[PDB]
Ligand binder design. Structure first.
Ligand code: NA
Length: 537
């Protein structure tokens, strides 16, 4: 049977299947295409999904949510320590691992974050099985791009516990791009910004896509910004309005606040499609009916700081990606909060009128991409950056990856040491800062450099790639015209698509460490006479 794509979200989860040439997002028992990531433990039963969320007020201690925040993390993590304070449920330390502790059937029980996530995955698997009419085993599960190897493995383990064979763990921004088919664009590399504003988290991701290959250039956002925050601003405003009108604070009554919050969430949805919404609550407090209205403009004023603040992570991501806003080719909206008209206007105005990709339901786009990838697994540009080793074993790129062929790139280099007799030209392929982490393709020596102080001799290195992809690397001593060259054959099938993806992924994993290595050397054009990788120490 077909594999399924699952968006394991912090607040809500979504499951989709690619069948008959089309992705179908699967509705649950109550007809909802999204299922709350909530598990509830009671004296009589365990509830997953809408049932768990509906009874949260009655059983807060035994209702678990935000397990994604704890997944793949140590208990001593500061995020876990700060996050634990907000949650009613208890978090405990077992062998350096956080666990949720709850009372189920009168017995204290402890579950690893992956175990709670496995229960949400079990419900999504059952939702898929009811729709398909067949057992579902294979799945593609999505995770935030910033997730580390531990967080990804823990998410895979949650699927394994649920009985799912997790074919691959893919980034949520990449899944959204796959849903819009940005990989199938016939032109040269494209820079894509994924603006993801969910119920509880805000994620901005910049990706570069060429030849079906995705690279995460930058990530930015707020882990604590979401639609619920917009609802809270409306609730606080209404509490103030009631207090001004009736001289009473409804904050004391928990149910009254819950009823107001429910009305505010409905009003916010109405405000996305209409310019005004009505709040009608009978007997909100002390028998006083609350009948009032809110304009879209008032809602925008209440959330003005939060809405404008979304641009700040966009600016940071662009700086980290070393890209100007003009260089973004595609913008994708993900998450329900992206429906808000003010958010769309602010992003479009920031991008100078650029159209936004919002045709796919923002709540379902990540699951849609996961479903497309699951089906693919179920059934001329340069592949890698090309460069030479500079002093310190550093990779200096002459031809960037995704460069159209044929191409010729020339750079000038100098000696690192005084009276250096020769330079060793070492050709490497890869996206890592250091040649040790890249692949050596060939080496040649240019000798007879006239004795001179360091930084004075000029050596022009040229990389020439023909249409067939054969690489010719040449070095000329500018003082004498003396030259040496190597021809590197293009071996067919040497590199698979997966091989390129692994090398790009490795660069994403070590980007912070790699940048520090780049900053270490004062000169970027200095060549030594030896191979740094073969040096002792
Ligand atoms: Na999401």
């Amino acid at each position: 049977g077909p594999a399924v794509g699952i968006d394991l979200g912090t607040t809500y989860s979504c499951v989709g299947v690619f069948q008959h040439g089309k992705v179908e997002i699967i509705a649950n028992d109550q007809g909802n295409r999204t299922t709350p990531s909530y598990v509830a433990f009671t004296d009589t039963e365990r509830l997953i999904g809408d049932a768990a969320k509906n009874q949260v007020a009655m059983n807060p201690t035994n209702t678990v949510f935000d397990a994604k925040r704890l997944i793949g993390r140590r208990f001593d993590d500061a995020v876990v320590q700060s996050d634990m304070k907000h949650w009613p449920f208890m978090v405990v330390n077992d062998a350096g691992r956080p666990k949720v502790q709850v009372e189920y059937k009168g017995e204290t029980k402890s579950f690893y974050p992956e175990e709670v996530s496995s229960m949400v995955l079990t419900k999504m698997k059952e939702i898929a099985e009811a729709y398909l009419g067949k057992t579902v085993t294979n799945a593609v599960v999505t995770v935030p791009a910033y997730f580390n190897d531990s967080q990804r493995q823990a998410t895979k383990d949650a699927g394994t516990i649920a009985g799912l064979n997790v074919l691959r763990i893919i980034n949520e921004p990449t899944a959204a791009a796959i849903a819009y088919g940005l990989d199938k664009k016939v032109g040269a590399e494209r820079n894509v910004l994924i603006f993801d504003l969910g119920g509880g988290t805000f994620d901005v991701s910049i990706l570069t896509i060429a030849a079906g290959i995705f690279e995460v250039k930058s990530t930015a956002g707020d882990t604590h910004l979401g639609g619920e925050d917009f609802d809270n601003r409306m609730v606080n405003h209404f509490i103030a309005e009631f207090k001004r009108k009736h001289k009473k604070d409804i904050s004391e009554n928990k149910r009254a606040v819950r009823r107001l919050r429910t009305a505010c969430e409905r009003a916010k949805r109405t405000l996305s499609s209409s310019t005004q919404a009505s709040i009608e609550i009978d007997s909100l407090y002390e028998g006083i009916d609350f009948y009032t209205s809110i304009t879209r403009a008032r809602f925008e004023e209440l959330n003005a700081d939060l809405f404008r603040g979304t641009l700040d992570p966009v600016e940071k991501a662009l700086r980290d990606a070393k890209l100007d806003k003009s260089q973004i080719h595609d913008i994708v909206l993900v998450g329900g909060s992206t429906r808000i008209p003010k958010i769309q206007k602010l992003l479009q105005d920031f991008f100078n009128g650029k159209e936004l990709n919002k045709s796919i339901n923002p709540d379902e786009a990540v699951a849609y991409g996961a479903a497309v990838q699951a089906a693919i697994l179920s059934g001329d540009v340069t592949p890698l950056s090309l460069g030479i080793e500079t002093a310190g074993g550093v990779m200096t790129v002459l031809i960037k990856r995704n460069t159209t062929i044929p191409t010729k790139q020339t750079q000038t280099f100098t000696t690192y040491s005084d009276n250096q007799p020769g330079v060793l030209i070492q050709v490497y392929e890869g996206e890592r800062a250091m040649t040790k982490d890249n692949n050596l393709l060939g080496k040649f020596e240019l000798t007879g450099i006239p004795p001179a102080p360091r930084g004075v001799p000029q050596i022009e290195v040229t990389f020439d790639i023909d249409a067939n992809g054969i690489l010719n690397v040449s070095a000329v001593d500018k003082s004498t015209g003396k030259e040496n060259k190597i021809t590197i054959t293009n071996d067919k099938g040497r590199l698979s698509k997966e091989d390129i993806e692994r090398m790009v992924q490795e660069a994403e994993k070590y980007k912070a460490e790699d940048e520090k290595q780049r900053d270490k050397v004062s000169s970027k054009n200095s060549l030594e006479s030896y191979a740094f990788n073969m040096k002792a120490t």
